[PDB]
Amino acid sequence: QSRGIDQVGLAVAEMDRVTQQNAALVEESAAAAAALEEQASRLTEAVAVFR
Amino acid sequence: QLTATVKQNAENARQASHLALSASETAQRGGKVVDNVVQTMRDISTSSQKIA
Incomplete structure (x- = not known):
């Protein structure tokens, strides 16, 4: 159990780090996805002059 | 695992408790027998004193 919990301790600590990395990618993708919404408006704005 | x-x-833990608990019962019973032998020595010593 002592040596066994050590394997789970590193596992929980390992998954904890990966959980933070995944959150960074979610926020990174969310921020990048939000940028597409702004750039997407530029496409219509570039042609908004033509009715 | x-x-x-x-x-x-x-x-x-339970198996050891059964043997440990059982080991205590035989120990307590042995102590009572030892106490009876203590009084026996007093009787032998007292009886031997009367013979002297």
Whole structure:
């Protein structure tokens, strides 16, 4: 159990780090996805002059 | 794997308690017998004193 919990301790600590990395990618993708919404408006704005 | 060791650790705990508890009963019974022998020495010593 002592040596066994050590394997789970590193596992929980390992998954904890990966959980933070995944959150960074979610926020990174969310921020990048939000940028597409702004750039997407530029496409219509570039042609908004033509009715 | 941890759950499997819990049963073993818990099983050995109860099994050891049965032997430990049983080992105490025979120990207490042995003490009472030793106490009876203590009074026997007093009787032999007292009886031997009367012979002297």
